[PDB]
Amino acid sequence: NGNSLSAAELTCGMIMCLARQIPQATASMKDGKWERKKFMGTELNGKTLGILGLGRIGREVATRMQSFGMKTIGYDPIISPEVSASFGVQQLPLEEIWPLCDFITVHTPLLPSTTGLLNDNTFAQCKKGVRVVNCARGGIVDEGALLRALQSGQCAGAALDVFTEEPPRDRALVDHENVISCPHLGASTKEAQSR
Amino acid sequence: NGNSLSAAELTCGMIMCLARQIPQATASMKDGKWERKKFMGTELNGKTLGILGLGRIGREVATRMQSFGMKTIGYDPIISPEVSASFGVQQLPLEEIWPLCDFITVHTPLLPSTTGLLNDNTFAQCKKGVRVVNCARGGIVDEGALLRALQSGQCAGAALDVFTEEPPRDRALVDHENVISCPHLGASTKEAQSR
Numbered sequence: 001n002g003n004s005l006s007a008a009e010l011t012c013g014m015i016m017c018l019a020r021q022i023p024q025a026t027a028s029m030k031d032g033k034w035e036r037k038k039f040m041g042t043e044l045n046g047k048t049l050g051i052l053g054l055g056r057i058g059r060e061v062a063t064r065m066q067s068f069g070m071k072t073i074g075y076d077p078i079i080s081p082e083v084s085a086s087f088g089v090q091q092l093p094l095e096e097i098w099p100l101c102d103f104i105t106v107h108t109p110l111l112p113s114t115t116g117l118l119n120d121n122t123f124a125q126c127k128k129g130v131r132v133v134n135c136a137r138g139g140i141v142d143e144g145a146l147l148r149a150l151q152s153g154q155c156a157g158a159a160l161d162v163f164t165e166e167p168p169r170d171r172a173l174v175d176h177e178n179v180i181s182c183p184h185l186g187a188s189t190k191e192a193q194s195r
Numbered sequence: 196n197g198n199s200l201s202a203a204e205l206t207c208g209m210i211m212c213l214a215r216q217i218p219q220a221t222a223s224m225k226d227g228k229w230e231r232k233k234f235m236g237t238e239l240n241g242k243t244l245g246i247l248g249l250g251r252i253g254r255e256v257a258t259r260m261q262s263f264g265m266k267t268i269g270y271d272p273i274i275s276p277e278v279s280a281s282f283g284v285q286q287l288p289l290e291e292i293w294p295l296c297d298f299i300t301v302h303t304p305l306l307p308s309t310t311g312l313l314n315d316n317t318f319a320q321c322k323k324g325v326r327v328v329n330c331a332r333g334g335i336v337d338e339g340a341l342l343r344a345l346q347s348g349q350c351a352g353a354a355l356d357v358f359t360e361e362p363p364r365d366r367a368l369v370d371h372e373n374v375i376s377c378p379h380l381g382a383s384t385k386e387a388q389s390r
């Protein structure tokens with residue numbers, strides 16, 4: 001609320017980090033390497049961003065990523081399509097979202113309906129090479145399914161601020177070359193902290 | 196031109212990585228650590244971004260970063276104030292830019308007038324804790340002066356896509372904890388490459 005913009009800004013950061021592999025490129029430089037071919041990336045302009053959860057954080061994400069020319073679609077069980085249209089998000093049923101997205105970001109609470117919202121079934125309906133962000137709640141993205149989708153290339157990259165257990169004991173996701181991560185930093189700014 | 200957006204997008208990525216230390220946090224997580232205090236960050240909203248160079252790239256950066264609530268000021272000797280106003284950038288003489296900025300990004304050619312545009316003299320006129328981005332040309336920021344500013348805290352962080360020599364033989368900047376780096380990836384996208 002007081003921390004909505006901190007959250008939204010970390011999410012946008014993560015999206016940019018996935019498009020350009022900035023954390024991986026920094027690690028590579030720090031290891032003494034100069035690896036230009038390895039870190040060929042993608043432009044955000046013209047890509048589709050699906051936003052699951054169209055509350056304050058999701059809305060803030062949307063208007064920022066609209067400035068980059070992303071097409072912003074999404075889903076929210078409460079917010080009407082005319083209202084989301086007023087902040088530039090096209091609402092579609094979930095089943096229509098999966099195959100359209102280049103990026104997916106989640107901004108929901110953790111409920112039975114949202115636990116494993118992204119799972120083996122929903123990854124298989126995604127466009128091959130989708131990139132996923134979870135800066136909301138650990139478990140919205142099923143971690144097992146995410147790992148399997150990273151291993152197959154079905155998911156080209158994930159950015160995780162949050163984990164089912166914190167700190168995470170299973171390290172397979174964190175250690176993956178296409179996963180970027182933070183120790184639950186979404187609200188960790190001097191401004192959010194200092195009301 | 197064809198690569199203006201790729202450049203702009205990397206620059207904005209780097210600004211977000213400086214505000215939130217996403218590359219350093221990823222490396223930390225990958226080393227099995229969970230270091231939440233260490234990576235307390237800042238919000239972009241309400242901060243001033245100084246844009247030196249107000250051509251296509253600089254303009255694209257400005258309108259992206261305006262969506263985050265940054266105040267965008269800048270300088271370009273050849274772009275009229277009226278043209279820059281049309282994309283929300285207030286032009287000021289260089290001497291007025293330095294003390295205002297929380298972040299400074301450069302989008303100029305490498306000319307005698309811009310070589311060491313950020314040097315010891317201009318760092319000393321910056322607000323303490325300025326963060327700097329160079330995704331333009333190696334040598335616009337004097338590397339020696341940047342290291343000295345990082346060591347004193349005058350500069351709180353820097354993001355470099357480009358170096359005076361490539362790959363850099365002096366590793367003190369790349370190795371600094373508050374420096375994020377890439378192996379000259381500003382035009383490395385499938386879209387820029389594939390006209």
Ligand SMILES: NC(=O)c1ccc(F)c(Cl)c1
Binds near residue numbers: 052
């Ligand atoms: N129940 C929910 O809040 C819910 C369930 C499914 C979803 F995709 C979203 Cl965005 C929210």
Ligand SMILES: NC(=O)c1ccc(F)c(Cl)c1
Binds near residue numbers: 247248289306309312
């Ligand atoms: N000569 C130039 O092109 C030049 C000199 C100083 C500057 F700050 C800028 Cl943006 C450009």
